[PDB]
Each structure stands twice: as C-alpha cells, then as structure tokens.
From Swiss-Prot, chain A:
Name of the protein this chain belongs to: Aldehyde oxidase
Residues of the full protein shown: 745 to 793 of 1338
Species name: Homo sapiens
Tissue expression pattern: Abundant in liver, expressed in adipose tissue and at lower levels in lung, skeletal muscle, pancreas. In contrast to mice, no significant gender difference in AOX1 expression level (at protein level).
Gene: AOX1
Protein purpose: Oxidase with broad substrate specificity, oxidizing aromatic azaheterocycles, such as N1-methylnicotinamide, N-methylphthalazinium and phthalazine, as well as aldehydes, such as benzaldehyde, retinal, pyridoxal, and vanillin. Plays a key role in the metabolism of xenobiotics and drugs containing aromatic azaheterocyclic substituents. Participates in the bioactivation of prodrugs such as famciclovir, catalyzing the oxidation step from 6-deoxypenciclovir to penciclovir, which is a potent antiviral agent. Is probably involved in the regulation of reactive oxygen species homeostasis.
Self-association state and partner proteins as the record states: Homodimer.
Length: 49, 49
C-alpha cells in the first residue's frame, strides 16, 4: 500500500518575532501543537518556556 | 537658625517640622478587588500576570 501527501492547501508557514526584552519570542505558526513549538524553540534558544 | 537670623539682615534661615497621617483605602470593597493568572509550564518556569 502506497503513501499519501497531506496536501493541506496552506503550505508550511510561520512568523517568528523577537520582542527585544528578556529574549522573549512570539511565534505565529500554522501548527497542530503549540506546546511542542514552545518547547523546541525554547530548547533551541536555551530559554525557559 | 535664631542665632543666624539675629546676625544676618539680607539672608535668613528657617526650620519647620510637619507630621503625616496618610489614610489608605477606597470607597468600597468592590473597588479594592484584584485578580491574577498563574501558569506553570512543564519545564517548571512560571508566567504570572
């Protein structure tokens, strides 16, 4: 049995905006799992959640 | 200061002391109500507002 492309009509999209204070990031992203986005971004920046 | 002022015609000193009772409180119980929101993320860090 063959695979299948998701083919969501909106392609992968995000905007990452640093606030400029305390290394605060705001992440606007087309995702199903914000808590996971928060984790991987914080980990990558060595920041608390 | 009394000594100074007896010896100086064109320059005077003065001294004063005032007490303070500053009462604190609003008109009603409802005016003093207050609220907060606290999250603990899974890395243990805290966001408060």
């Amino acid at each position: 049995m063959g695979g299948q492309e998701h083919f969501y009509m909106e392609t992968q999209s995000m905007l990452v905006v640093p606030k400029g204070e305390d290394q605060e990031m705001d992440v606007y992203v087309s995702t199903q799992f914000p808590k996971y986005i928060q984790d991987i971004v914080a980990s990558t920046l060595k920041l608390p959640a | 200061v009394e000594k100074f002022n007896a010896e100086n015609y064109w320059k005077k000193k003065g001294l004063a002391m005032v007490p303070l009772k500053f009462p604190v409180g609003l008109g009603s119980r409802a005016a003093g109500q207050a609220a907060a929101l606290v999250h603990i993320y899974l890395d243990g860090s805290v966001l408060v507002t």
